Amino acid sequence: MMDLAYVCEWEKWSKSTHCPSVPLACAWSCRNLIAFTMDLRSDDQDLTRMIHILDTEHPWDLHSIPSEHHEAITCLEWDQSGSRLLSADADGQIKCWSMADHLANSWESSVGSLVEGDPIVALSWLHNGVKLALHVEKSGASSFGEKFSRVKFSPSLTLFGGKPMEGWIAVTVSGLVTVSLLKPSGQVLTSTESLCRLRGRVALADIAFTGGGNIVVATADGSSASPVQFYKVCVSVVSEKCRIDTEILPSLFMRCTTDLNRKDKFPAITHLKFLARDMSEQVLLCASSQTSSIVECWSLRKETILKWRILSATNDLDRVSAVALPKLPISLTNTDLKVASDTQFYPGLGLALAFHDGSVHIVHRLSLQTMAVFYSSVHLKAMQLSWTSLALVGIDSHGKLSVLRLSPSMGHPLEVGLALRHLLFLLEYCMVTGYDWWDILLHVQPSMVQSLVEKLHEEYTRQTAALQQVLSTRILAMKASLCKLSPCTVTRVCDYHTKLFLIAISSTLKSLLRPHFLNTPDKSPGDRLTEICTKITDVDIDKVMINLKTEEFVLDMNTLQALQQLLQWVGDFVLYLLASLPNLRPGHSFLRDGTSLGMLRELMVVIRIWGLLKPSCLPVYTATSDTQDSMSLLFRLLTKLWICCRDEGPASEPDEALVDECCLLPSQLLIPSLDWLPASDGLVSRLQPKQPLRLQFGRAPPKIDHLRRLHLGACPTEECKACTRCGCVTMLKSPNRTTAVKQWEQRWIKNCL
Amino acid sequence: QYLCQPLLDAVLANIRSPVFNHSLYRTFVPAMTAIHGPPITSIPSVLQGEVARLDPKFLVNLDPSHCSNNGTVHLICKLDDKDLPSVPPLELSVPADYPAQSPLWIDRQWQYDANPFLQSVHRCMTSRLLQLPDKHSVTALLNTWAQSVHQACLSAA
Ligand SMILES: [Zn+2]
């Protein structure tokens, strides 16, 4: 069901006067980040020369980068990993924008290239040389390697082994090409060269890569009566700069002009595209007259030795204003077309087209046939698709932004099983890679959330003992995000995400202590301590402490003070969990899980050892029992609760004695507080099918530091940072840096879980 | 002061610290929570008003010429008094931020000349405007105009 997700517009942006039209650009990154520019001409020129950065999770707040460009910006490109942006305009001024302090709301540039007076018509990054192939036939192969297969292209400009070199290449309005390379340091090497001795107008240009480390550049004059030239380019760094070797390739001529019936129509070429970057064997052309347009595809297949032929041509089209290409790497083999046709699986067989009406068309790739038509009830000037191709962003000839939901079925009814298989196959692609899944969450129904979660749970298992080790955080986060959509399972999300924290605080402590004398060789301290704790089921804590070699657990008595907040949080969580017995609660999942209880159980023996080493770092219990060991009381109940679930498939219910003894607990131990981290602010849980949402700018229709357990005032003083997905808030500049746990702070400088 | 010096010393020796709020909260939230429980759940308006509140002897309005919709406005005046004759319009210019300042009168010497009555009015006008104090308003000047015309008419007959 092709639908409209939400339309975003900005107040006061419209009502421009004396404004000639200017072309626009758009760019979608690996993460759900949109970079674009819009025609404003509102009381200042620079509003038309700003870079707008948008995050799809929070459309209402937009970031503006005041680029110091002198002419209209031509093109915008993202890197292979969405950490840098390439922007270029007329009169040179190619800029490389870098993220500031790992904040998406601050950008700064220090690298650039410049050629004086020549507008840039083509610009691209260099290739890294890694791609994958997806087979829909093997969607049930039960093997990650079997599903997504390596294709093994070759990288360009390999230096000192198999590590590629980064840089960019640009083609100007004339027959001029510039190449820039980046050293591992801040050094940059730039060079320029002429394509060929034939110097003429190059109105349109395109750049593609080929296997072996070669670049194919296509130039079009735009008169529809002249050939489109093709050139081959090789870049080599001879010890001081990048030299360019260029040679000529066979050209072609436009169709729909030898028909000898009506050739005066379509007198100008307006679009020249490559069907897919790194796929240089297919070229799409789009010509248009003042009223109608034609779109054609050509290929360089082997039957001169190399010739360009015709593949498809549409009947009749209106004026073409925007074209968008898919990004999903379909295998395109013969055996896959039949299984992608019988099953409604069309994520990479569509090309998106826009016209001067409110009509948007999805046309088949190999043969230009229309399959999906959308009417808006104005025209679209710039637009883009997604990696999974579940949605497309569009900019109209106004201040509006649109996001449209594309479904794989495209209106054809399907059963539940096929939809579940499609969704899990698409999710595993984002599992293998580092890409997000917001557009995937745009289409998941609330009814089939539980089936998806459970089936993904068994998909996580039965891997070859290595994929599970590096996908635990992702497998937790994906299902935590999934479970918040269905109101039946909306209450279990806090059981997942908080659980994640319990690993982190436990992972940094077992590696924080380094023994000054080794004991029990061929065993890490964490493993030996865990097996000792799971080998002894003694009721109280004093007997267990004896045989752990207390003389070794010694620290520098400086990081111990910085750990006080974490230990206090652990103790408060233990107290809350023990007091939650007499109760569907945010802490219900930990009662029936044995590993979490066990880990929390050995988490406290070490802090008992540290507290007997230093009493100031102990968590401050507010118990009304001066002569009774509160933490030993907690340990006794924790051990009693642990033995009831450590059995392999216990299926047992706690006895009434435990219930009443935990009932008596709050009469002795106060429960201070607790904070729920998954603050519901995303738009995924708010949108509804066939219910478009119209949101405006800056509308957006007990504050704690969640990373380090520090309380702020009624109104916080210093500015902070907010996570996009989880929504956690943490202080920007930490107060204690000379005396802090550097093993804990360094784990969150780049991203949050 | 008395009985509370230790608190002042502690606060002054603790202030402008990055963890002051955390310290205060951690040291003073639990007792307060336990004892009491949960916490609480163009043309400026002044000119328009002064024109609205003038005697119906005057029907001042915007000048057809000159600029408008700015801080400085121009007004043309007409006098309709049964007991007084007709006189030159006596236009005025109002600068921006009319309160806490005074307007100025654009003199037109040739208009008031060639008649003993009109130049007598003019010299009485100069005398009265020299007698007016600072920070005056436009209604005072209009009343001065009316009274000067009346005095000149009385002196003539
Ligand atoms: Zn986060």
UniProtKB/Swiss-Prot annotation, chain A:
Keywords per UniProt: Activator, Nucleus, Repeat, Transcription, Transcription regulation, WD repeat
Molecular function per GO: nuclear thyroid hormone receptor binding; nuclear vitamin D receptor binding; transcription coactivator activity
WD repeats: 10-60, 61-108, 109-154, 155-192, 193-246, 247-303, 304-377, 378-409, 410-444
GO biological process: positive regulation of DNA-templated transcription; positive regulation of transcription elongation by RNA polymerase II; positive regulation of transcription initiation by RNA polymerase II; regulation of transcription by RNA polymerase II; RNA polymerase II preinitiation complex assembly; transcription by RNA polymerase II
Keyword Cytoplasm: no
Record-linked Gene3D superfamilies: YVTN repeat-like/Quinoprotein amine dehydrogenase
Function, as annotated: Component of the Mediator complex, a coactivator involved in the regulated transcription of nearly all RNA polymerase II-dependent genes. Mediator functions as a bridge to convey information from gene-specific regulatory proteins to the basal RNA polymerase II transcription machinery. Mediator is recruited to promoters by direct interactions with regulatory proteins and serves as a scaffold for the assembly of a functional preinitiation complex with RNA polymerase II and the general transcription factors.
Subunit annotation: Component of the Mediator complex, which is composed of MED1, MED4, MED6, MED7, MED8, MED9, MED10, MED11, MED12, MED13, MED13L, MED14, MED15, MED16, MED17, MED18, MED19, MED20, MED21, MED22, MED23, MED24, MED25, MED26, MED27, MED29, MED30, MED31, CCNC, CDK8 and CDC2L6/CDK11. The MED12, MED13, CCNC and CDK8 subunits form a distinct module termed the CDK8 module. Mediator containing the CDK8 module is less active than Mediator lacking this module in supporting transcriptional activation.
PANTHER family (UniProt xref): MEDIATOR OF RNA POLYMERASE II TRANSCRIPTION SUBUNIT 16, THYROID HORMONE RECEPTOR-ASSOCIATED PROTEIN-RELATED
Protein name: Mediator of RNA polymerase II transcription subunit 16
Source organism per UniProt: Homo sapiens
UniProt gene name: MED16
Swiss-Prot record, chain B:
Posttranslational mods: Ubiquitinated by TRIM11, leading to proteasomal degradation.
UniProt note on tissues of expression: Expressed in all tissues examined, including heart, brain, lung, spleen, thymus, pancreas, blood leukocyte and placenta. However, the level of expression varied, with highest expression in the placenta and peripheral blood and lowest in the pancreas and kidney.
Annotated compartments: Cytoplasm; Nucleus
Induction text: By 12-O-tetradecanoylphorbol-13-acetate (TPA).
Top-rank lineage group of the source organism: Eukaryota
UniProt subunit comment: Component of the Mediator complex, which is composed of MED1, MED4, MED6, MED7, MED8, MED9, MED10, MED11, MED12, MED13, MED13L, MED14, MED15, MED16, MED17, MED18, MED19, MED20, MED21, MED22, MED23, MED24, MED25, MED26, MED27, MED29, MED30, MED31, CCNC, CDK8 and CDC2L6/CDK11. The MED12, MED13, CCNC and CDK8 subunits form a distinct module termed the CDK8 module. Mediator containing the CDK8 module is less active than Mediator lacking this module in supporting transcriptional activation.
Functional note: Component of the Mediator complex, a coactivator involved in the regulated transcription of nearly all RNA polymerase II-dependent genes. Mediator functions as a bridge to convey information from gene-specific regulatory proteins to the basal RNA polymerase II transcription machinery. Mediator is recruited to promoters by direct interactions with regulatory proteins and serves as a scaffold for the assembly of a functional preinitiation complex with RNA polymerase II and the general transcription factors. Required for cholesterol-dependent gene regulation.
Family affiliation: Belongs to the Mediator complex subunit 15 family.
Name under which the protein is recorded: Mediator of RNA polymerase II transcription subunit 15
Organism (species): Homo sapiens (Human)
Residues of the full protein shown: 615 to 788 of 788
